[PDB]
């Protein structure tokens, strides 16, 4: 009656396709070796716990948000603060930078993902529109176009927004638990969202349905990022491990964990080549993982509190990190 | 200097932004952050004044910012840490609700749910050294109902009189027993709605006592 037999068939089909793990294939790949990551720029000015930051397409501009009620855009090269946008709700949980750099989004414990226009002829940054369609805290708001933005909310459903109209173009209600993160594909045709139910679902922007689901993690998923090729993504969860999933192989490929780590992951990112996986941790440090061999290629120390967010430049020059200590540091 | 004409102006703008951020942070620091949980929450807010709700009130030179969660039914474990460092936690419970079952085929009692929530918040790792201001509301209805429905229905092991004072004392003792870290933090328990202005007085007194105790602990005198 209640789809008893359907559950086992998918599991059997997925298991039947397992022939060789990623680790076995990458045996002949030479180790990357330790990377001498050193902070080149230290960004100060935030006086509270920063929760999210995002790089711009130019690989020089990034935006950060903090519980102090301020949304700051940084000039990475010179560390010059580009804008200081006061958030009307000081509970921000996420922020984003538009691909063109014209607009920036933020979301907090309120159910509104505000859109800010950075290129106003008025000069002053103003809230272009307020997207009040959610019933829970917003976990991730990400731009696909200057007019389309996809949002993640604690209400367990994502929403595609037509910004000019201000109404949800599409709703993604397949998740049963709170969705904590959202990552767009390189082509922006589909996106993946992680949720506290220890599962990740593949969402199609145009049609709006769950093409596939992944359940490797044993705890709440906190972050997900798309592999540069666009056919794979990495997950981050409180399970203290990161897992790699392929959209076409339908099965988990590899995991990133060590016995010395017993705390959850806050954020995950990839380099241009995809060989390096930049993952934040609650132990006030970020560990760089060999994406093809799961070996810890480096550690980014220097944070006095939990690392909340991190990201890699589009040009692949430097990786920014954010921590509850209110300091953002650029690593190269 | 290596900087160009525009770079110097950009640096000037950056340091102006730094000054503005520092000023705003200093302004925000001099303000009391109160977390409210709970049950008479709306009545208490009315007497003392779809996401989290902010309420601002001032009482004799001290400014309070109250953050009502606003019925955030999402995972509280994922955003409770956002309130780490609040001066005190306000908890509201309705005494008269010892009979309600919160539907769900009578699998729970609202008093039991309130006790469980209070225990979870008090034992929360992010509030190890955070005081709790416990408010017992709807005392009139509780007194009216106990005279016709004994509280033993809510506490089968309770063997005592159904008079208002004794039942209230037993409920207060039960709520305070949940504190497994009694030494680190104190629970300021009050029975409200005597008059509308007493709740703010109790909140102010509790905040003042918490601040004084923290100052003493910093110096090692407490």
């Amino acid at each position: 009656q209640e789809a008893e037999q359907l559950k086992n068939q998918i599991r059997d089909a997925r298991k039947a396709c397992a022939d060789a793990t990623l680790s076995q294939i990458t045996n002949n790949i030479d180790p990357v070796g330790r990377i001498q990551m050193r902070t080149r720029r230290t960004l100060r000015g935030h006086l509270a716990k920063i929760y999210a930051m995002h790089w711009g397409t130019d690989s020089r501009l990034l935006v950060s948000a903090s519980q102090d009620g301020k949304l700051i855009i940084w000039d990475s090269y010179t560390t010059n603060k580009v804008h200081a946008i006061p958030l009307r709700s000081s509970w921000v949980m996420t922020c984003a930078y538009a691909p063109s750099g014209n607009y920036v989004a933020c979301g907090g414990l309120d159910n509104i993902c505000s859109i800010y226009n950075l290129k106003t002829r008025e000069g002053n940054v103003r809230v272009s529109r307020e997207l009040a369609g959610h019933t829970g805290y917003l976990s991730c708001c990400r731009f696909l176009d200057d007019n389309q933005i996809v949002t993640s909310s604690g209400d367990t459903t994502c929403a595609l927004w037509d910004i000019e109209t201000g109404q949800q173009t599409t709703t993604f209600t397949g998740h049963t638990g709170d969705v904590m993160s959202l990552s767009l594909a390189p082509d922006t045709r589909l996106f993946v969202s992680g949720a506290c139910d220890a599962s990740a679902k593949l969402w199609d922007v145009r049609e709006g349905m769950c093409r596939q689901t992944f359940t490797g993690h044993e705890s709440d998923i906190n972050a997900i990022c798309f592999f540069p090729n666009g056919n794979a993504f990495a997950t981050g969860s409180d399970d203290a491990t990161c897992r790699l999933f392929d959209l076409r192989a339908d099965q988990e490929l590899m995991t990133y964990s060590h016995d010395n780590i017993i705390c959850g992951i806050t954020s995950v990112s990839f380099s241009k080549s995809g060989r390096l996986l930049l993952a934040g941790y609650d132990d006030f440090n970020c560990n760089v993982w060999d994406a093809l061999k799961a070996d810890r290629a480096g550690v980014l120390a220097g944070h006095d509190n939990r690392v909340s967010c991190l990201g890699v430049t589009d040009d692949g020059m430097a990786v920014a990190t954010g921590s509850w200590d209110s300091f953002l540091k650029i690593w190269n | 200097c290596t900087l160009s004409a525009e770079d110097k102006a950009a640096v000037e703008r950056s340091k102006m932004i730094d000054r503005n951020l520092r000023e705003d942070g200093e302004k925000a620091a001099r303000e009391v952050k109160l977390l409210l949980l709970g049950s008479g929450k709306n009545t208490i807010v009315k007497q003392m004044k779809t996401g989290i709700v902010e309420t601002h009130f001032t009482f004799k030179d001290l400014h309070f910012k109250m953050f009502d969660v606003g019925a955030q039914r999402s995972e509280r474990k994922k955003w409770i840490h956002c309130f780490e460092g609040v001066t005190a936690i306000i908890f509201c419970v309705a005494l008269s609700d010892y009979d309600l079952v919160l539907a769900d085929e009578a699998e729970m009692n609202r008093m039991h749910a309130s006790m469980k929530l209070f225990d979870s918040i008090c034992n929360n790792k992010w509030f190890t050294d955070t005081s709790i201001i416990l408010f017992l509301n709807k005392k009139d209805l509780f007194e009216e109902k106990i005279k016709k429905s004994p509280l033993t229905i809510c506490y089968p092991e309770y063997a005592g009189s159904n008079t208002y004072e004794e039942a209230a004392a037993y409920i207060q003792c039960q709520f305070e027993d949940l504190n497994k870290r009694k030494d680190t933090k104190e629970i300021y328990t009050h029975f409200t709605c005597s008059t509308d202005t007493k709740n703010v007085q109790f909140v102010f007194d509790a905040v003042t006592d918490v601040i004084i105790k923290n100052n003493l602990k910093d110096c090692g005198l407490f």
Epitope: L61, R121, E122, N124 | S4, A5, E6, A9
Partner: single-chain antibody, 232 residues
Framework: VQLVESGGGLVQPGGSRKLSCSAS????????MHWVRQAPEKGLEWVAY????????YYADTVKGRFTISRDDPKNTLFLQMTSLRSEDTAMYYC??????????????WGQGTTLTVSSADIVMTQATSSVPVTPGESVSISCRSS???????????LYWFLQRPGQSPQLLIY???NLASGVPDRFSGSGSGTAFTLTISRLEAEDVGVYYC?????????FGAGTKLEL
């Protein structure tokens, strides 16, 4: 966004007057303001610069001292006090907004302008042709030269192109030698070497008639070129 100058008039020899310029529709406090003078039948010329917050103030060698610049952020207005005005000071002054950050477009908006009549390692910008007779529909290329290389060590080239149509304030076309200013057709293009630059127009329209001016922003002692006056 609007800027409105005021205070124009006729001044006796050695007289003193103050020009004013109010700002509306944009965050005046966050934008640096410049004063650009233009003697009649002559090119533009930078006068003074006051940064946001009044922290940084710059003056031209020929105006420093007797000309002072101040801003009133609460009232959103700009001032330029003048003393010991010389006959050479006969010119019309234009106020220009500017906000400095990566990706910005300095000098993207210009004020109405006000008329005023009376009675050293600086980079010199020269334009090859003062006037170029052309016809509509034909691509027009305007070249300019700089005495000092404008390519800075940071990788940016600080070249600006402005168009001043008859009876209109200057309008920005190119501000970093590669970037097209907002509110302008895509026809305009900018390219050049480390010292040599040109403004190529894909196709000429009726409204493109005017005088084209160039500037270097590598160092603040800005210098204007002769100006290329297109005619049909």
């Amino acid at each position: 966004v609007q800027l409105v100058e005021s205070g124009g008039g006729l001044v006796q020899p050695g007289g003193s007057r103050k020009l004013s310029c109010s700002a509306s529709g944009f965050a005046f406090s966050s934008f640096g303001m410049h004063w650009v003078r233009q003697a009649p039948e002559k090119g533009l010329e930078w006068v003074a610069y006051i940064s946001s917050g009044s922290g940084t103030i710059y003056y031209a060698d020929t105006v420093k001292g007797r000309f002072t610049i101040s801003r009133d952020d609460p009232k959103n207005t700009l001032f330029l006090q003048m003393t010991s005005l010389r006959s050479e000071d006969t010119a019309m002054y234009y106020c220009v907004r500017s906000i400095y950050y990566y990706g910005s477009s300095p000098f993207d908006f210009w004020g109405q302008g006000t008329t005023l009549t009376v009675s050293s390692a600086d980079i010199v910008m020269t334009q090859a042709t003062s006037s170029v007779p052309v016809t509509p529909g034909e691509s027009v290329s305007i070249s300019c030269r700089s005495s000092k290389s404008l390519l800075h060590s940071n990788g940016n080239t600080y070249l600006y192109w402005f168009l001043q149509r008859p009876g209109q304030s200057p309008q920005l076309l190119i501000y970093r030698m590669s970037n097209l200013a907002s509110g302008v057709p895509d026809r305009f293009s900018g390219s050049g070497s480390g010292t040599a630059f040109t403004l190529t127009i894909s196709r000429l329209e009726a409204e493109d008639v005017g005088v084209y001016y160039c500037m270097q922003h590598l160092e603040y002692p800005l210098t204007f070129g002769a100006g290329t006056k297109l005619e049909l």
